[PDB]
Amino acid sequence: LLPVKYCKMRIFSGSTAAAPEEEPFEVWLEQATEIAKEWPIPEAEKKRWVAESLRGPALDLMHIVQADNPSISVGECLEAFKQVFGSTESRRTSQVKYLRTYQQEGEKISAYVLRLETLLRRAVEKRAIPRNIADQVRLEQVMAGANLGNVLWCRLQELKDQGPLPTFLQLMKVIREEEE
Template identity: 45%
Template sequence: MAMTLLEDWCKGMDVNSQRALLVWGIPVNCDEAEIKETLQAAMPQVPYRVLGRMFWREENAKAALLELTGAVDYTAIPREMPGKGGVWKVVFKPPTSDAEFLERLHLFLAREGWTVQDVARVLGFQNPTPAPIPDMRAEMLNYILHNVIPPLVESIGYRKLTLFSGRDILGPGEETFDPWLEHTNEVIKEWQVSDVEKRRRLMESLRGPAADVIRIFKTSNPAITTAKCLKALEQAFGSVESFRDAQVRFLNTYQKPGEKVSAYVIRLEPLLKKVVEKGAIDKDNVNRARLEQVIVGANHSGALQRLWLTAVAEGPTPNLFQLLVQIREGEAEEEEAEAVLLQLGLKGPL
C-alpha cells in the first residue's frame, strides 16, 4: 500500500518515484515544525525537500512526500525513524543498477568537488585534441578509474544478503540471527570488493534495532570494519550459550533413526563450529573431535560401516571433506550389497 501511494503521488506531481521518499505514520496532531525537526534529525546527510503532506485514511495518520535534491547515499536513508507518537516509516524505490551506479558516482564526485563534465573534459570528450592533464587532476582521474569505477561495476548484480532487524516479531523477508549470520558470512566471502563496500552492503540488510546498533558504533568509530560490525551484532543478538552448554549439545547429538551417517555429519558440523567458537575445542583438534563424535554418535548399522569406522579410527584423521567422501563410499557399497540381497530374496541387515 505504501509503495502504491508513493508511486501514485509521484505521478500526480510529475516527480520521479526513484527520487522520492514517502514518510508515513505521522500523528495527525503533528505540525509542520515537528515534522521538519524529526526529518532533519533522522536524515542529516540526505538532501531533500518536502513536496506535500496528506492524511492517509487507511493508516489514520499523515504521510509526507519528499523529493531528493542531490546525490544520495541510499544506505543513509533509514527505513524507520523515531518521531512523535512512535515510529515513523520510510518507503522508497530501490534504484536500478544503472541508476545506483550513476548515483554513487555523482556522490563521490560531489564529495571531491568534481562534476561529470569535469571528468569528461579531462578525458578529452569535449575537445578534438585533449588538453594536457594537470598532475593533480591526472592523479584524481587515476584514482577514480582504479578505485571508484571497479567497485561500482562489481556491485551491479551482486548476491545480496537476507534481512535482519533483531525484532522479536519478524517482518516480511526477515530471518532470525543465527541463520542470517551464517548466510551473511558465506556471502561476504564471495564479494571481491573493499571492506567499505562490504560494510555498505551489510547495512542494506539491516533494519530496526540491528541497524541502530551499527549506526551507534559508526558514530563512535566511523572506520569500523565489517568484521567488527558482525561481532557487535553477535554480541547484541547472538546466542548467550556458554562454552559448556555448546559442548554438551555437541556431545549429545546422535544420528537419528533412518538418517544416513553422511547427513548426520553435516548436521553435526554447525554444532562443532559453535563449540570451536566458544573455545571448548582447539582449532587444531577439530578433525579429531569430529571423527570421535561420529564414531560415538552414529548408529553403526551394517558390518561394512563398522569395518569402515574402525579403519578410519586407526588411520590419519580426515578433514570434513575426506570424512564425507569415505562415508559416502561406504554407504554406496552397503546400498549395493543390500540391493543384491533383495534380488536374491533375502532381507535384513548385513
C-alpha cells in the same frame, strides 16, 4: 543493452521464526562487515546498504541505534548487532551442544557428518576442543550420535583403531563410498 549477471542480497531478520531465504546471523555479519570496511561508498550510503538487508526485529534494532545517535559509525552499529544477536556460547555449553547432537531421522550420514563438522569448528574457535584430538571426537561422535550400523560401523571402528585417523574430506570420501 544486454543482460547483467546480478547477485542476491543476504537478508537477515533476527526472528526465531526466520523465513526460508533469511540467513543465520554470522553469515549476515560477514556481509555487513564487507559493506562497513571494504566498499568505496560514503558512510551515509553504507548505512542505507546495511539497512536494506534488514527486515523485522533486526531492522527495528537499526532504527533504535540510529535514533539514539545519528552520528554513529557503521562499525559501532555492527558492534551493537554483535552485542544483541551474536552467539553466546562458552566451554561447557559448546562441548555439550556438540556431544548432544545426534543424527536426525531425515539426514544421510554424509550430511550429518558435514553438519557435525560445523559444530566442531565452533567448539575449536571457543578453545573447547584441542585441534590435535578433533579427528577422535569426529569418529567417536559420529559412531555415538549416528543411526549407522553393520559394515559401515565396522569400517569406522577399523579406522578408529587404524592409527592415522581421517581428516574431514577423507572421512567424507569413505562415507560417500558407503552411501553408494
